[PDB]
């Protein structure tokens, strides 16, 4: 049948993608960095708690001050924390309990959040009567949002259960761009340094790469064995890495479009929640199940150390803009600072 | 600049005496996640407490919300972990529609062999018993083709049946009860428990059952954290 | 790539004997908890058998009782699926379905439209 033509058509064109990347398979990337010296280990340690939520943490987001940050929990709260002096700016109260996700504006003017209401609310940080209230709410998704990020402060990419992502414009309220291809459940996305591009990960055990301004996806990665759960870039912005279910950190190329390392242990068997690099990309962090945070040598595939201290689930984690810490939230109701 | 750190200081104190009366409502307010098929007979359970996400219930001046997600996909797997804290989940069946039953089986057994659910306990409301009365009496539609073990199996010496039952409507729906104990006895090792319970469309008491089985969760955890039980 | 083939099946009187064969690869064979799911023609899809990692615990929905059997082989990798006694109620669309996760004893795998790590389907037809 014509359905059938296309099939195989499609595996033709499978097979020639194996192929293109088969040729550019003549190292690999330990072989390549086996006369690095190693980043030693790596010994960090609680330089901060951050108190006061009273349900399970599962979502955060530093902002570019590298001071302030949001943190949303489950009990219907969006709390923002000066993580310097522990002080809370704000507790925004949320019509539904059951939020997914947050992020925080890059001009600091603005939060998000979204979860099982299907829904994107903005709360706008600089009212003039007083107190931070709703200004807008993003609607059109039949599923749960899983991740969103600004652009700027009219621009936001949602990402969704209902298997797409999707591109907003704050004002108008109008989704100005659709992302469709996966099959699973979007559950996270990553934004470039250049806002010029960005990467989704799903429950298809894969990643695609998306031109913000065109609406196409520009490159499909398949490496990951389990759902995809978490999505950072290399902060040179040409590579990124991935965590799934299967206990297993891995990083792309976006010009070699294939992967170039796996970061594992036999005795992790756990998923990962979130993953994130250093300033330099030299360190990439990992949050699992196991109750632990690892951190990987992205150069070297050797763990240099671990940040046990965590009651429940690490659902979450992120790196300041400048470098200076790192703080992670998990399923204990507290975030904790670790520099 | 000092002044900034004292206006943040009672900032931080008028959001920390907010949190503080936001946890004494949180702690007493009963989350309850109701998961089910449709078809079940799920709507009609919102409706008799009095189709929405939401369900807001007072039993004995005790506050419950429950809630039945609804513009959801049918990939109930990353959203699960959503609820590991909930106080329990209803799980809602059709003791009627006998080629549904698997399914019913199969997602029991996803959510309580859940690495995330160890111990969520549910209880169990097997709906639409007269329709199940009016099909094992009609003998059209017989158990024995779907599930082969009830031609083998005996009524419990437990089974309390209503007045004027048929022995054969007490052994079927006591089959289906034993059938999901199978499942909740195999692997709950005493961190959660299953509650099942008989229900029609028209009973009236249905919050009196949740509350009395959100009671003896609470007391069971209690009597377990002491390790008494 | 996560990928899956299955096998086998075809036009087969009442009362015959088939064999399904999934063919796995993209992933550890062992870690996985498996299933087989069949879809009948104008109806939605029902799971008819499960499997363990190592083939310990095995089960079987009530219609497929005592005469279908599941197996697995991890060094060849492959889930086998030997169907006996074939009813014209039997025909369906067969798939290999892999649960979710590794070392888990739950998976939610009879998605109605779009389950990621499911099989292409392999048709069988039982008519006289």
């Known amino acids: 049948s014509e359905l059938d033509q296309l099939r195989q058509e499609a595996e033709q064109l499978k097979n020639q993608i194996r192929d293109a990347r088969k040729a550019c398979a003549d190292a690999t990337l330990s072989q390549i960095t086996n006369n690095i010296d190693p980043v030693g280990r790596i010994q960090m340690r609680t330089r901060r708690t951050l108190r006061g939520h009273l349900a399970k943490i599962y979502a955060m987001h530093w902002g570019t001050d590298s001071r302030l940050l949001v943190s949303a929990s489950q009990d219907g709260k969006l709390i923002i924390w000066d993580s310097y002096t522990t002080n809370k700016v704000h507790a925004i109260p949320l019509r539904s309990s059951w939020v997914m996700t947050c992020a925080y504006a890059p001009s600091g003017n603005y939060v998000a959040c979204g979860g099982l209401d299907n829904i994107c609310s903005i709360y706008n940080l600089k009212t003039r009567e007083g107190n931070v209230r709703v200004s807008r709410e993003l609607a059109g998704h039949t599923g749960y949002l899983s991740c969103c990020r600004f652009l700027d402060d009219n621009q936001i990419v949602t990402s969704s259960g209902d298997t797409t992502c999707a591109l907003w414009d704050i004002e108008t309220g109008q989704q100005t761009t659709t992302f469709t291809g996966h099959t699973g459940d979007v559950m996270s996305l990553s934004l470039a340094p250049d806002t010029r591009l960005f990467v989704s990960g799903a429950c298809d055990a894969s990643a695609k790469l998306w031109d913000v301004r065109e609406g196409m996806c520009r490159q499909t990665f398949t490496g990951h064995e389990s759902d995809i759960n978490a999505i950072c870039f290399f902060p040179n912005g040409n590579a990124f890495a991935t965590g799934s279910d299967d206990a297993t950190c891995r990083l792309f190329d976006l010009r070699a479009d294939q992967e170039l390392m796996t970061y594992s242990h036999d005795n992790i068997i756990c998923g990962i929640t979130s993953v994130s690099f250093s300033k330099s990309g030299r360190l990439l962090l990992a949050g699992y199940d196991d109750f632990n945070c690892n951190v990987w040598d992205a150069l070297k595939a050797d763990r240099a150390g671990v940040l046990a201290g965590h009651d429940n689930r690490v659902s979450c984690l992120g790196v300041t803009d400048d470098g200076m810490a790192v703080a992670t939230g998990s399923w204990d109701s507290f975030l904790k600072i670790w520099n | 600049q000092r002044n900034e750190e004292k206006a943040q200081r009672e900032a931080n104190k008028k959001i920390e005496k907010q949190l503080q009366k936001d946890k004494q409502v949180y702690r007493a307010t009963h989350r309850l996640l109701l998961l089910g098929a449709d078809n079940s007979g799920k709507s009609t359970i919102v409706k008799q407490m009095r189709g929405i996400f939401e369900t807001k219930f007072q039993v004995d001046k005790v506050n419950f919300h429950m809630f039945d997600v609804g513009g959801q996909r049918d990939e109930r797997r990353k959203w699960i972990q959503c609820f590991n804290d909930v106080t329990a989940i209803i799980f809602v069946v059709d003791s009627s529609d006998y080629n549904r039953l698997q399914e019913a089986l199969n997602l029991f057994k996803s959510i309580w062999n859940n690495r995330w659910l160890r111990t969520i306990s549910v209880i169990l409301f097997l709906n639409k018993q007269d329709l199940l009365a009016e099909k094992v009496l009609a003998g059209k539609s017989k158990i024995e083709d779907y599930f082969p073990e009830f031609a083998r199996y005996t009524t419990p010496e437990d089974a309390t049946p209503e007045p004027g039952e048929d022995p054969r409507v007490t052994r079927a729906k006591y089959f289906i009860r034993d059938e999901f104990l199978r499942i909740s006895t195999a692997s709950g090792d005493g961190r959660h428990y299953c509650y099942p319970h008989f229900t029609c469309a028209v009973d009236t008491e249905n919050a009196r059952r949740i509350f009395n089985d959100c009671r003896d969760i609470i007391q069971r955890m209690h009597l377990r954290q002491y390790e008494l039980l | 790539q996560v990928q899956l083939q299955e096998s086998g099946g075809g036009l087969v009187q009442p009362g015959g004997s088939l064999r399904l064969s999934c063919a796995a690869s993209?992933?550890?064979?062992?870690?996985?908890?498996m299933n087989w799911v069949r879809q009948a023609p104008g109806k939605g899809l029902e799971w008819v058998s499960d499997i363990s990692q190592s083939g310990a615990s095995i089960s079987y929905t009530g219609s497929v009782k005592g005469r279908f059997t599941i197996s697995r082989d991890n060094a060849k990798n492959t889930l086998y699926l030997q169907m006996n006694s074939l009813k014209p109620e039997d025909t369906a669309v067969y798939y290999c379905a892999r649960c979710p996760a590794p070392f888990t004893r739950d998976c939610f795998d009879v998605t109605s439209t779009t389950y990621a790590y499911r099989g292409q389907g392999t048709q069988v037809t039982v008519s006289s």
């Open positions: 993209g992933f550890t064979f062992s870690n996985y908890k």
